[PDB]
């Protein structure tokens, strides 16, 4: 049979370059003959043989007649869908995996693990599916909108880890991690440390011994909760990133939250999922992060890097590495994933570029993708090309 | 070569949860650019590597111009179609298997057996197809609308069983079972017991020794004929379920048919196919059934359970386990199937949710699917989302 | 590697039954959202693992804007296309094999051999393609519309035979057979006997030693030239079928051509391709043929059978076996093919049912398919369901 | 694992014949229900098991609403797309490989190498992708529109070569070759000889020891730079073809550039990519080339041949072999590729036939394909069939 997947060293490179864009709505004109699915929270996850593009469709297409509701996040119609990376996510092209208004997915080397969450707000449920079969579920512990990553889970030697979180969007949401194995949950991991609010974690393997995440704190701070999970002892701790280059939105001027690394600063009520990914080298660790270009709105998107250091205690601003999206273009949830190449892993960052033209029309997303390629500086940005009045 | 499929123990779980919905007509607006096939009597059947979604299309799509006739059940255009479970059943996406206005299908571990029925009413024919080849047929014994399950046939060690029935919808219809093997019929099984009317059987393996079914009796009773087929001796007997929780539609108040289990009660002319499925445990048997929420109309749908007991003689009402569809939504034929997971079977229930807006427009169905997942109570219901005036 | 295909004994059965219909234009309304390709001369050919549906598209779809010319047979746009048997032949679904306005195809057990003919009328060319590669060609010997079978070629032990014909539609057209092998022609076979006009041969294996065909004679007779090709010595002879049940169209009353079997009778200028297929049994040969129901027009279609006998010398009318299409429905070119089942061959007959509504609109075809299944009599006919004004 | 691909001897044949046409816009009427992608610079590349059709889409379909810009060559929306040879390149059918406004691709026997170029004009970048992973990049050396072949790269024993060029379209553009291996560049090859302007090289293997190309010189001459690359020593030299049959466009009367082979003649500002391909025989080399029929405009297309000889020093006009496209039809970029057959290579020529109706509407291309087949003379030409006002 095949073998279990493990993280290898990253492929050599030093900069990130535009790689692909998936703009389904370039094909959704009334005069056109297509039907791209209406989606949001897209993410990409790969296996040894291929990468797939996931999303949560609102079960409607463009052009269509079910646009009311597309702008909201939860309902009985939402489904986690997927197409192979490179295909346009359309009605026929897409494969519906399960009903869900929050989700994750990851390949363990053998089959795919799809995660989905749905049910009432006051009592939602995390559904786990192994390939073709529905394998397990997990209930609401804090009874306020159980939810998940919205990016890929990470599997090592057959065990996949996954952050889940229950709680108020504007208050307390203590997250927990799940060690799933072959569809079945085999251990819950209660994180230690600064746990008042951690949601939408973007996780990855810094090594075979540790998974790390840059998450969202939706109520108390503009800084980002940074999880470090020890896979050896299935223990996890959280502390705020110390860097002055605050990675959340909305947020204030860099390095303006006075105090120790642990200082929240003003609430800056709100947040956004942020891409983060590791570039493991033999004797160094490259950590890459994205941030919107606007301090206040979800416009534009920049890439940062900081080799080595403890995110928990280093105040130093991250190194700017390029503008993937400009302030004139939409920059929403961003995430990281890794393409598996013959001998090494290629770290990447996908950016959900949302089309939003009010709540009186359709609402959907495009997916831009930057990956580590050779050297130099990042050279070009991404535009969607989509005109919403077509 | 591959091996023959057998029933294993069910995967551990205790409750059923919403898993997936397939609502093709969410994409059939005049302003949209899709073409979901117009169908009815959908069912799902799986193999070791995948599940497929079957149905009987009226050979027309939405939007289209051949809506007259869609509301009727038999004609020279109807075809048994299929897509992989998760794909939207559209003109291009679908694969046409054979001409048929009644059907079944099941995978034996090696290839697929598709069943289809067509021909004149007074002399229809059961056509059997092994994979790509047309292998055998079976004629009308009672010369009044020969018909079949409308859900999956069950194969064990290479032999597939299938209930067929000939007779008046409003009178006598004695069913027979067929032991097919590799496309060819190798034995007819004449059932013993209460055989005055048994149609649309929903069958499954309670064990390696016995197949069991909950069928429809269209003329004499609101109770359901319950078939028990001994695979060792290819013998089958039928008796009415004794439970007070009558599973058919239309039907009267529970436990109001006075008399022994064998008492029909008032005719309650009409019926409906009902989902039923087994949850085999090492030392126990879990039997699950669906019933519409309305006593009189095909609106809503509830899940029931009763571990162990003889359905033939136990008066006890079944245990309610959840509302999969509410009385505001359509609840028509329901069925059960089992997903094959690496080491166990995952029992499930699909519900055909029909869009019916008169006989002066299109008529088609959506497919909701609940499967056994973890614990707790069933949490959420299914809606179709479809507006028929689009 | 795989092995070479050979003819085996037919699967046991005694009658033919409706199996499938492919009516693409049921989905070509202006209000619909599909694009079935506009085609003609469809045929079906199988391999050990699957059957494919071939045709010659006019490189335009319905609804579309290139209907002028669809009614004619030859031009620089026509292409031989194919979809797997069961899929609707649409723009995206179809695979374009080569440019051709006449064609054939057959699987040798290993790869597919596609044949196509195109070029000027006074000097056309037979193009042979082995799988993905263009392998050989063959030129016009009589310089008047080189053309081919329009149904499957037959391969035995790696050698495929194929009838080609050059000459006037209203005069002399001596056909020749080609023994192709792995894409390359390795021998021409000049037929002996009654060679004044033989076109559109429908061929098959009566055994491992002989291929036989029922062809069209377009100028001199209503009877059908019957080719017998000895695969041992690659020699072929032709004589007219002696039967009174004349199988061509137009034609006069059965048994009314007075004289020996070799008597042509009145010209009955015109012809039509006719389905023919073998049902080889251990000690008997079943030969099946189709004929339109109307003596003069291409309306309706009937099945005939005659076990054993020499088609060359038996005057006996064939045995009627059923009406596959009624006189109210279109019955054009018909053909025979054989599905390969695990241990035997299943003979079949496809009927091209043409939609013709003048030369001032689209012109295309549907494909009905009857195969040998069990016993009894053929029970039901085929209708297209297509309304041309939609 | 599989083996590395090498060039074998060509399949025997002597002439070229029309093989296939891909005219997506035959299906892009407003009244039709399709969506062929709007593209340009199409090319075809094969592997041991299949050929794929590549192109640079303008990320818009017909009919659609994003036609402005389609006529230009560079922007942030352009993507290198592909479908299997024979499929119509449509939104759903196509697979998007990467963002790029110039590209190449080739199969090494194991996986596919896709090449793409994008970024600012004054500093573009060559992106290399190995199968699913982004593997390497290469920067602008002359800072003026880095660009690539626009036809297939050639791989031998695991090493793929690829011409890249940087410089002014109307001045100096010295090209370089890249020896890529498994996604990673492992050597740059600076060509010796007449290097003032060489772009859009159409390359192939004349043998295992040498790759050869017919390229474009956009500013100085109507003659074509002819590259000869020694794979043994990874060295390359360039000189102008000496033949009087000038293969570029615009160009003057044949044999009218007076002087040695090295004489440029008048600038004839402009150029066009031209198909070229080798027909390697045991003891001879057949070189085939295409040229537009019009000396000044990109209308029509003719095939030429010249067995043996040094293109660098032979003045002899090439031998005309046929008109693939007439002067009434569009003849733009042409290229050569080779289908891999069981035991030999089948050389071919694809012709990009562009639909151009001003800059106030859509702009796209069709792909005609001639391959070496049997003997005789080329018999028939290609038309597109497309009416731009539909
Ligand atoms: C489950 C859910 O509501 N997912 C979301 C999706 C989008 C957005 C969003 O920020 O647009 C927010 C949420 N919720 C949280 N808590 N971030
Ligand atoms: C063959 C056939 O008529 N199938 C049906 C389909 C639907 C329905 C139905 O209840 O909607 C009924 C039938 N017939 C029976 N006897 N139940
Ligand atoms: C090559 C070609 O013309 N094929 C045809 C197709 C249809 C028809 C037809 O009968 O409709 C006729 C022909 N020609 C001949 N000779 N039968
Ligand atoms: C990169 C780029 O501009 N590619 C082109 C495409 C088409 C055309 C063309 O000739 O239509 C020209 C170019 N550029 C050059 N230098 N030939
Ligand atoms: C983890 O272990 C496997 C080899 O056992 C391999 O993926 C890799 O060397 C290790 N991970 C890293 C980042 O080195
Ligand atoms: C039936 O037999 C096979 C093993 O021979 C296996 O599927 C299973 O153990 C048996 N079925 C059940 C329900 O135990
Ligand atoms: C032809 O030969 C092979 C076995 O060698 C097999 O297909 C079959 O027995 C023979 N054909 C017939 C019709 O018997
Ligand atoms: C190149 O080498 C391989 C055999 O090693 C084979 O492709 C061929 O014989 C050689 N190429 C040519 C053109 O002969
Ligand atoms: Ca925050
Ligand atoms: Ca489609
Ligand atoms: Ca009843
Ligand atoms: Ca005739
Ligand atoms: Ca030039």
Rounded distance between C-alpha atoms, residue D314 and residue D312, angstroms: 6
Query: In a mutational test of the pocket of ligand 2, which residue from B56, B57, B73, B274 has the highest number of ligand atoms less than 8 Å from its CB?
Result: B73
Kindly state if the Cβ of B169 falls inside 6 Å of ligand 2: yes
**The residue to which tokens 């090449």 are assigned:** D115
What 3-state DSSP class applies to B26? helix
A79-84 and A51-61 strand pairing: antiparallel
User: C213 and C186 in contact (C-beta within 8 Å)?
Assistant: no
Torsion B188-B193-B196-B199 (CA) sign: negative
Atom of ligand 8 nearest to the CA of D280: 13
Are residues B34 and A61, on separate chains, in Cβ contact within 8 Å? yes
Kindly state if the Cβ of B361 falls inside 6 Å of ligand 6: no
Residue C117 CB coordination number (10 Å):
27
Q: Where are the alpha helices (DSSP H) in chain A?
A: none
Q: In angstroms, how far is CA C376 from the centroid of its own chain? A: 26
List strands edge to edge, sheet with B102-107: B102-107, B112-118, B125-130, B133-139
User: D103 and D87 in contact (C-beta within 8 Å)?
Assistant: no
Task: Determine the Cα angle at C2 with ends D8 and D53, to 5°.
Answer: 50
- Is D333 in the active site? yes
Among the listed residues B10, B13, B61, B66, the one whose alpha carbon sits nearest the alpha carbon of residue B33: B61
List strands edge to edge, sheet with C284-291: C276-281, C284-291, C299-307, C319-330
Q: In angstroms, how far is CA B361 from the centroid of its own chain? A: 26
| All chains having 3 or more CB pairs closer than 8 angstroms to chain A | B, D
Among the listed residues A381, A248, A243, the one whose alpha carbon sits nearest the alpha carbon of residue A324: A381
Among the listed residues C154, C75, C119, the one whose alpha carbon sits nearest the alpha carbon of residue C347: C154
User: B33 and C33 in contact (C-beta within 8 Å)?
Assistant: yes
Among the listed residues B350, C167, B380, B221, the one whose alpha carbon sits nearest the alpha carbon of residue A76: B380
Q: In angstroms, how far is CA B380 from the centroid of its own chain? A: 22
Which positions in chain A have a beta carbon within 8 angstroms of at least one beta carbon in chain B?
30, 32-35, 59-61, 63-66, 76-77, 79, 91-92, 94-99, 118-120, 123-125, 127, 130-139, 182-183
Rounded distance between C-alpha atoms, residue D257 and residue B137, angstroms: 79
Q: Kindly list the protein residues whose Cβ atom lies closer than 6 A to any atom of ligand 5.
A: A 6-9, 207-208, 280
User: B59 and B77 in contact (C-beta within 8 Å)?
Assistant: yes
Residue A176 marked as a ligand binder:
no
Q: Exposed/middle/buried for B49, CB within 10 Å: 0-12, 13-18, 19+? A: exposed
Cα Rg, chain D, nearest whole Å: 19
Which regions of B242-343 does DSSP assign to beta strands (E)? 276-281, 284-291, 299-307, 319-330, 334-340
Longest dimension (CA), chain D: 58
Are residues B64 and C382, on separate chains, in Cβ contact within 8 Å? no
What CA dihedral angle connects A127, A131, A132 and A134, to 10 degrees? Answer: -20
Residue among A11, A20, A29 whose CB faces D99 most closely: A20
Among the listed residues D375, D337, D288, D280, the one whose alpha carbon sits nearest the alpha carbon of residue D20: D337
Pick the catalytic residue from C73, C314, C356, C381: C73
Are residues C387 and B133, on separate chains, in Cβ contact within 8 Å? no
Residue D221 CA to ligand 13 center (angstroms) comes to: 5
Which regions of C255-380 does DSSP assign to beta strands (E)? 276-281, 284-291, 299-307, 319-330, 334-340, 345-356, 363-372
Among the listed residues C342, C346, C368, the one whose alpha carbon sits nearest the alpha carbon of residue C355: C368
Q: Kindly list the protein residues whose Cβ atom lies closer than 6 A to any atom of ligand 8.
A: D 6-9, 207-208, 280
Interface test with A, best of B379, B381, B383, B387 (most A CBs within 10 A): B379
Kindly state if the Cβ of A73 falls inside 6 Å of ligand 1: yes
What CA dihedral angle connects B169, B175, B177 and B180, to 10 degrees? Answer: -40
> Residue A146 to residues A96, D69, D365: CA-CA distances in angstroms?
21, 46, 51
Rounded distance between C-alpha atoms, residue A228 and residue A204, angstroms: 10
Residue D232 marked as a ligand binder:
no
Are residues B130 and C342, on separate chains, in Cβ contact within 8 Å? yes
Rounded distance between C-alpha atoms, residue A88 and residue A352, angstroms: 15
| B29 contacts on A by Cβ (under 8 Å) | 64-66
User: Which approach determined this entry?
Assistant: X-ray
Residue A199 marked as a ligand binder:
yes
- Is C333 in the active site? yes
Task: Determine the Cα angle at A319 with ends A314 and A324, to 5°.
Answer: 135
Are residues A65 and B373, on separate chains, in Cβ contact within 8 Å? no
Minimum distance, in Å, between the CA of residue D300 and any CA atom of chain A: 32
Torsion B140-B141-B147-B152 (CA) sign: negative
| C13 contacts on B by Cβ (under 8 Å) | 136
Rounded distance between C-alpha atoms, residue B220 and residue B270, angstroms: 9
Among the listed residues D231, D259, D252, D254, the one whose alpha carbon sits nearest the alpha carbon of residue D244: D254
Are residues B120 and C374, on separate chains, in Cβ contact within 8 Å? no
Tokens linked to A49: 């043989």
Phi and psi at residue C354, in whole multiples of 5°? -85, 135
**Cis status, amide bond into D63, omega within 30 of 0:** yes
First vs last C-alpha separation in chain C: 50
User: B364 and B356 in contact (C-beta within 8 Å)?
Assistant: no
User: A387 and A27 in contact (C-beta within 8 Å)?
Assistant: no
**The residue to which tokens 């699967």 are assigned:** C11
Residue A255 CB coordination number (10 Å):
13
Q: Which residues contact B273 (CB under 8 A, 6 or more apart)?
A: B41, B150, B151, B200, B202, B216, B333, B334, B335
A154-156 and B112-118 strand pairing: unpaired
Tokens linked to D261: 């082979």
Which domain covers residue A26, as residue numbers?
Answer: 1-390
Rounded distance between C-alpha atoms, residue C205 and residue A179, angstroms: 62
Sequence-distant contacts of A252-258: CB under 8 A, at least 24 apart: A252/A222, A252/A295, A253/A295, A254/A317, A255/A315, A255/A317, A257/A221, A257/A222, A257/A223
Which regions of C102-220 does DSSP assign to beta strands (E)? 102-107, 112-118, 125-130, 133-139, 147-148, 154-156, 159-167, 173-181, 184-189, 192-193, 199-205, 210-216
Atom of ligand 5 nearest to the CA of A207: 13
Kindly state if the Cβ of C78 falls inside 6 Å of ligand 3: no
Q: Which residues contact B266 (CB under 8 A, 6 or more apart)?
A: B222, B252, B257
Residue among A30, A97, A137 whose CB faces B373 most closely: A137
Rounded distance between C-alpha atoms, residue B226 and residue B205, angstroms: 13
User: D233 and D165 in contact (C-beta within 8 Å)?
Assistant: no
Among the listed residues B360, B358, B380, B384, the one whose alpha carbon sits nearest the alpha carbon of residue B370: B380
| A46 contacts on D by Cβ (under 8 Å) | 132
User: D353 and D335 in contact (C-beta within 8 Å)?
Assistant: no
Atom of ligand 7 nearest to the CA of C7: 7
Rounded distance between C-alpha atoms, residue D216 and residue D199, angstroms: 5
Rounded distance between C-alpha atoms, residue C263 and residue C158, angstroms: 38
**The residue to which tokens 């059961």 are assigned:** B126
Residues facing D165 on adjacent strands? D147, D175
Q: What is the DSSP letter of A26?
A: G
Are residues B29 and A65, on separate chains, in Cβ contact within 8 Å? yes
Minimum distance, in Å, between the CA of residue A116 and any CA atom of chain D: 26
Rounded distance between C-alpha atoms, residue D148 and residue D169, angstroms: 13
Rounded distance between C-alpha atoms, residue C93 and residue C67, angstroms: 21
* Total structural domains within chain C: 1
Q: What is the DSSP letter of A121?
A: G
Residue C68 CB coordination number (10 Å):
12
The CATH code of the domain that includes D39 is 2.120.10.10
A363-372 and A16-22 strand pairing: antiparallel
Kindly state if the Cβ of A291 falls inside 6 Å of ligand 1: no
Tokens linked to D154: 């050639």
Q: In angstroms, how far is CA D51 from the centroid of its own chain? A: 15
Query: In a mutational test of the pocket of ligand 4, which residue from D43, D55, D72, D73 has the highest number of ligand atoms less than 8 Å from its CB?
Result: D73
Q: What is the DSSP letter of A27?
A: G
Q: What is the DSSP letter of B317?
A: P
Which residue on chain B is closest to C84 by alpha carbon?
A: B95
Tokens linked to A310: 């403890």
Are residues C118 and D34, on separate chains, in Cβ contact within 8 Å? no
Spell A52-83 as b/e; 16+ CB within 10 A means b: bbbbbbbbbbbbbbbbebbbeebebbbbbbbb
Q: Which residues contact C4 (CB under 8 A, 6 or more apart)?
A: C108, C109, C110, C155, C156, C157, C158
Kindly state if the Cβ of C199 falls inside 6 Å of ligand 3: yes
Q: Kindly list the protein residues whose Cβ atom lies closer than 6 A to any atom of ligand 7.
A: C 6-9, 207-208, 280
Q: Which residues contact A266 (CB under 8 A, 6 or more apart)?
A: A222, A252, A257
Rounded distance between C-alpha atoms, residue B374 and residue B17, angstroms: 9
Residue B213 CA to ligand 11 center (angstroms) comes to: 15
Q: Which residue puts its alpha carbon closest to atom 3 of ligand 3?
A: C73
Among the listed residues A68, A87, A72, A79, the one whose alpha carbon sits nearest the alpha carbon of residue A27: A87
**The residue to which tokens 């800084």 are assigned:** A223
Phi and psi at residue A25, in whole multiples of 5°? -80, 0
Tokens linked to A239: 């502390």
Q: Which residues contact B152 (CB under 8 A, 6 or more apart)?
A: B43, B44, B45, B104, B105, B106, B203, B335, B337
Residue D53 parent element (H or E): strand D51-61
Tokens linked to B90: 């559209």
Residue D47 marked as a ligand binder:
no
Minimum distance, in Å, between the CA of residue D128 and any CA atom of chain A: 9
Q: Which residues contact B367 (CB under 8 A, 6 or more apart)?
A: B21, B22, B42, B44, B53, B350, B351, B352, B353
Among the listed residues C88, C68, C67, C91, the one whose alpha carbon sits nearest the alpha carbon of residue C79: C91
């Amino acid at each position: 049979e095949p073998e279990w997947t493990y993280p290898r060293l990253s492929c050599q490179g030093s900069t990130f370059q535009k790689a692909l864009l998936i703009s389904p709505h370039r094909f959704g004109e009334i005069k056109g003959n297509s039907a791209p699915l209406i989606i949001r929270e897209p993410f990409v996850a790969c296996g040894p043989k291929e990468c797939r593009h996931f999303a949560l469709t609102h079960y409607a297409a463009q052009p269509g007649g079910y646009y009311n509701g597309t702008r909201k996040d939860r309902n009985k119609l939402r489904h986690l869908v997927s197409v192979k990376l490179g295909k346009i996510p359309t009605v026929e092209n897409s494969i519906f995996h399960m009903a869900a208004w929050s989700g994750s997915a990851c390949h363990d080397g053998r089959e795919w693990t799809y995660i989905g969450v749905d049910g009432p707000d006051n009592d939602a449920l995390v559904k786990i599916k192994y390939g073709e079969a529905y394998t397990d579920t997990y209930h609401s512990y804090a009874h306020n909108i159980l939810r998940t990553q919205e990016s890929a889970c990470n599997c090592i030697g057959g065990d996949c880890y996954l952050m889940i979180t229950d709680g108020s969007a504007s208050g307390i949401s203590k997250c927990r991690f799940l060690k799933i194995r072959e569809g079945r949950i085999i251990k819950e991991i209660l994180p230690t440390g600064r746990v008042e609010h951690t949601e939408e974690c973007t996780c990855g393997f810094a090594s075979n011994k540790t998974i790390e995440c840059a998450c969202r704190d939706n109520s108390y701070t503009a800084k980002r909760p940074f999880v470090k999970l020890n896979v050896e002892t299935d223990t996890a701790e959280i502390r705020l990133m110390c860097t002055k280059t605050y990675l959340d939105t909305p947020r204030p001027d860099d390095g303006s939250i006075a105090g120790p690394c642990e200082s929240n600063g003003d609430k800056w009520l709100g947040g956004i999922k942020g891409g983060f990914v590791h570039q493991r080298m033999a004797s160094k660790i490259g950590r890459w992060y994205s941030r919107t270009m606007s301090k206040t709105n979800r416009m534009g998107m920049e890439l940062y890097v900081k080799y080595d250091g403890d995110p928990w205690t280093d105040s130093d601003a991250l190194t700017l590495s390029g503008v993937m999206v400009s302030i004139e273009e939409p920059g929403w949830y961003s995430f990281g994933f890794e393409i598996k190449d013959k001998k090494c892993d290629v770290p990447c960052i996908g950016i959900e570029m949302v089309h939003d033209g009010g709540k009186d029309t359709w609402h959907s997303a495009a997916t831009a993708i930057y990956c580590l390629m050779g050297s130099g500086q990042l050279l070009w940005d991404t535009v969607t090309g989509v005109d919403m009045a077509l």
